[PDB]
Every structure is written in structure tokens, then in C-alpha cells.
């Protein structure tokens, strides 16, 4: 239809939450380990267990980071979202 | 008190379930379901699909396990692609 679909507004929300957190420290277009942690603990507090150990955020960043700059760009964050969403899906 | 990010993820699951459930395999998008999904729900991000050739090309790109349909994981890859391109105009 002509209204923004639920899908199209979901995509936008993904962009907004990324930019909401990537803009905090350093590079405004990437998530340092610092910003990723806050995102997870604050915005995924119903799907994922809170992170309070540094080893965890390091390992998550290690798995998310494919271009090897030690931070998560948007493309890499969409991959992360894909994984988590997939996990919630297998709840039938 | 669920977050916007979490609502967005859930809307992703919901729209897949809405369209995949219409025809055939209720857990997968066949070509016709995918086309309707794009035309009805992505009308502001993608140009409308009018040609079979176009449906064909899109599904082939998305179908990574070779069964001719788009399961959920293949749909998430699709949503990642689309969102990332849009991201460049934000």
C-alpha cells in the first residue's frame, strides 16, 4: 500500500537504533565494543541476556567483525540482527 | 515494555509468516509470494515488480540452498541487503 508498511518501518527502526548508538564515541558510522554493549543491554534486554563481562562483548565483536577493524559497521550489524532474529524465529 | 529494535525484529518475523503462509509450503516464499511481498510491503524502497524475468532474478539471488523458494534465513539476508542500501540515504 501507500502507507509505510510494518516491514518498511522495521527497517527504518534498524537504521535509527544503529545510528543512535554508533554516533556516541569515535566514528559516528561504526559501533566500537563500547557502543555495541550498550545497544545489546538496552535494546535487546528481552531477547538476549545482559552483558556485564568484558570477555563476552569482545567475543561477540570478534564474531561480528568481518572486515577486521575492531568495530561493527552497519552491514555487520545487519548480520547480527539477522542471527538474533533467526534465533527468536525458531520459537515456532 | 519491549524496545523498538525488538519490535522491528518481531515485525520481520510477522511479515515473513504472513506471506509465506499464503500458498504452498507455509514456511517458505515461492516466487509469487515474494513478488506480492515486495509490491505490497516494500513499495517505497523497491521499484514495483512487473516482469517474471525480475521475479526470477530476485529469487535466484536469494535462494542459497537451491530449492526454488525463500525460507526465513534467506529472507533475513534479503532484508539485510535492502536495509543496508537504504542506510546509504540516511
Amino acid at each position: 500500500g501507500s502507507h509505510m508498511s510494518e516491514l518498511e518501518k522495521a527497517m527504518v527502526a534498524l537504521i535509527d537504533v544503529f545510528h543512535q548508538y554508533s554516533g556516541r564515541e569515535g566514528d559516528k558510522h561504526k559501533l566500537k565494543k563500547s557502543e555495541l554493549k550498550e545497544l545489546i543491554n538496552n535494546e535487546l534486554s528481552h531477547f538476549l541476556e545482559e552483558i556485564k563481562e568484558q570477555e563476552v562483548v569482545d567475543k561477540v565483536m570478534e564474531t561480528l567483525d568481518n572486515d577486521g577493524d575492531g568495530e561493527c559497521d552497519f552491514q555487520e550489524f545487519m548480520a547480527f540482527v539477522a542471527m538474533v532474529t533467526t534465533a527468536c524465529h525458531e520459537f515456532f | 515494555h519491549m524496545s523498538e529494535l525488538e519490535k522491528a525484529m518481531v515485525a520481520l518475523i510477522d511479515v515473513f509468516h504472513q506471506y509465506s503462509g499464503r500458498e504452498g509450503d507455509k514456511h517458505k516464499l515461492k516466487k509469487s509470494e515474494l513478488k506480492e511481498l515486495i509490491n505490497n510491503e516494500l513499495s517505497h524502497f523497491l521499484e514495483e515488480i512487473k516482469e517474471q524475468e525480475v521475479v526470477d532474478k530476485v529469487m535466484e539471488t536469494l535462494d542459497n540452498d537451491g530449492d526454488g523458494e525463500c525460507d526465513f534465513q534467506e529472507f533475513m539476508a534479503f532484508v539485510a541487503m535492502v536495509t543496508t542500501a537504504c542506510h546509504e540515504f540516511f
Partner: peptide, 15 residues
């Protein structure tokens, strides 16, 4: 507006 065909753990006890 717009585009076209280009084409390039944990979890928890929840509802």
C-alpha cells in the same frame, strides 16, 4: 527513493 534488483550465543526465557 529509490532502488531495484542490485543484490550484493544466548537468547533467554521469553514470550
Amino acid at each position: 527513493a529509490m532502488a531495484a534488483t542490485y543484490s550484493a550465543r544466548r537468547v533467554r526465557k521469553l514470550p
